[PDB]
């Protein structure tokens, strides 16, 4: 009824959006809990990884109070542009997407004593640097850290609603992963002292560890059997000498195409990986054999 | 403006990545969050065994140097996070930066460069292009201790090291 | 008191690990103080937060620990710490590279 359009129409009234709440007289404390609906591929070839997430902040705006028969007020998108919101950015994000199918994927809840529940739902690209020594026995801790971009610590400080375990939660199957496992988070928060001030950073870890099956099965068992028939070459009789140099050279050519095929389908790096060493050492083996 | 972008945009989550601070002097800082793709012409000649020099140019689109002047703020300090980049394949060697004034027939316009000279890590290409081209090359001489009359094993071998050689070029064409 | 205690790394660049330092008072009890991140981002501990500043020269591959507002029960032994913070980045278990430390003391 005219109660709820009276309340919407009114409370812009005298607001300026350019200024955060509590400007020069407090400091704007941000709770702030994320919801992982699916922890999207990893891309080691671009050190990258997709997470979808709610991820929704919550803060005190006294300039929004009201009073009402109702509690709880929903603003539409088009007013809930025209108020301040934190300028939350991802401090590892590659190319973010914030879901506008079928209406914008966002809502902005006001109470009735001025606190604001600002709710969205994120796709995000974020770096994860790699150390590929042990590869493929390698394990990472994939990084999401988030924070004001403009508002520095003194500012605007971000906390976890929740305890900071508990304030990251991942959904049951929301863990899109072929290569890796994803064994826990750790949640955590930090300070960035920038060359435009101190910012505070919340950052959660995912930690993975690479499936190691389809390297036991494809390359390393392979490349053992091919080495397994080097050796086999020394029991035939020394006067077969056609066969035996055809075994050694054929073995030498097998081997070489594993170690093509094997280092084909994975990232470029410079250094070498565990798997480039154990090749390296096939490719002496049976070279020595012949 | 950068010269020489071919794909730039400013990050646009949860808002855009822009900052204004006004201090009470007057000054304005105005902050942005770019992600750039940037042409640098490569010299791969001398690949793998090669550097690179990746530059990134900034200037003015419609002011000269009497409407507008450029400067590397802080120095040589002006540009940092470098020394924190570890590349996969390269290696930062050194970042330099430039401001100089382009005297355009019609006027001067200013000018910032900052420069990275890049070196090629070959620990991949040592250990895996390399070294099978030279196993096989040396596989390839077994043939001179065997027999003249054994022409079958000597043909196989030499016939099947050349037929590695194929392999392995062929393969290294397709993945490099 | 005020105190500066340095770290220098050799053998190999941890500009992509954490870098972090940690107490050893006696007991056998080992404690986090800071950690530094290739983001240089900045974790403390509770028990020396504010007081204790952590920093990195990437290219002198070296993590500093400045010490501001000494007291008699500091008194331990420092270890500097890196690597990659797996399940950690607050557990001495995640750090795979410990130096022979450093005793301090304090008297009043």
């Known amino acids: 009824t005219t109660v709820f359009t009276r309340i919407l129409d009114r409370l812009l009234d005298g607001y300026d959006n350019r200024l955060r709440p509590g400007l020069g007289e407090r400091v704007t404390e941000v709770k702030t809990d994320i919801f992982v609906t699916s922890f999207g591929p990893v891309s080691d070839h671009d050190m990258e990884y997709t997470i979808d997430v709610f991820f929704r902040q919550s803060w005190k705006d006294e300039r929004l109070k009201f009073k009402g028969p109702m509690t709880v007020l929903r603003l539409n998108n088009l007013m809930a542009s025209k108020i301040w919101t934190p300028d939350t950015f991802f401090h590892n994000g590659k190319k973010s997407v914030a879901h506008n199918m079928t209406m914008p994927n966002k809502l902005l809840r006001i109470t009735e004593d001025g606190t604001l529940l600002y709710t969205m739902r994120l796709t995000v690209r974020a770096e994860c640097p790699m150390h590929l020594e042990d590869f493929p026995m390698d394990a990472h801790a994939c990084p999401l850290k988030f924070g004001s971009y403009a508002y520095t610590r003194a500012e605007v400080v971000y906390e976890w609603t929740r305890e900071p375990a508990r304030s990251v939660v991942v959904a049951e199957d929301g863990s899109r992963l072929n290569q890796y496992d994803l064994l826990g988070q750790t949640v955590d928060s930090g300070i960035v002292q920038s060359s435009t001030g101190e910012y505070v950073v919340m950052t959660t870890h995912f930690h993975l560890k690479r499936k190691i099956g389809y390297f036991v099965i494809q390359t390393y068992l392979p490349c053992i059997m091919t080495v397994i028939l080097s050796q086999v070459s020394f029991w035939l009789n020394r006067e077969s000498v056609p066969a035996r140099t055809v075994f050694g050279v054929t073995t030498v050519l097998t081997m070489t195409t594993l170690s093509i095929s094997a280092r084909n389908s994975l990232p470029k790096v410079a250094y070498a990986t565990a798997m480039d060493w154990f090749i390296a050492v096939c490719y002496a083996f049976v070279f020595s054999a012949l | 403006y950068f010269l020489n972008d071919k794909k730039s945009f400013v990050h646009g989550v949860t808002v855009k990545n822009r900052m204004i601070r006004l201090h009470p002097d007057g000054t304005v800082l105005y902050g942005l969050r770019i992600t750039t793709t940037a042409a640098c012409m490569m010299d791969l000649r001398r690949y793998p065994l090669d550097e690179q020099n990746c530059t990134l140019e900034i200037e003015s689109y419609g002011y000269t140097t009497d409407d507008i002047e450029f400067y590397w703020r802080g120095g040589d300090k002006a540009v940092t996070g470098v020394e924190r980049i570890e590349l996969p394949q390269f290696s930062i060697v050194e970042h330099r930066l430039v401001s100089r004034n382009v005297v355009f027939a019609t006027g001067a316009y200013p000018r910032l460069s900052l420069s990275f000279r890049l070196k090629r890590n070959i620990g991949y290409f040592i250990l895996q292009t390399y070294m099978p081209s030279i196993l096989i090359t040396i596989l390839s001489w077994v043939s001179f201790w065997i027999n003249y009359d054994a022409s079958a094993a000597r043909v196989a071998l030499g016939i099947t090291t050349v037929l590695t050689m194929t392999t392995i070029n062929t393969h290294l064409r397709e993945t490099l | 008191g005020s105190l500066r205690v340095s770290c220098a790394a050799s053998g190999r660049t941890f500009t992509t690990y954490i870098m972090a330092w940690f107490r050893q008072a006696p007991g056998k009890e080992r404690e986090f103080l800071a950690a530094m991140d290739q983001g240089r981002i900045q974790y403390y501990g509770d028990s020396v937060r504010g007081r204790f500043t952590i920093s990195r020269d990437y290219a002198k591959n070296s993590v500093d620990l400045q010490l501001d507002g000494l007291r008699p029960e500091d008194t331990a032994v420092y270890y500097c710490?890196?690597?990659?913070?797996?399940?950690?980045?607050?557990?001495?278990?995640?750090?795979?590279?410990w130096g022979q430390g450093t005793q301090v003391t304090v008297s009043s």
């Open positions: 710490a890196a690597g990659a913070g797996f399940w950690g980045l607050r557990t001495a278990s995640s750090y795979h590279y």
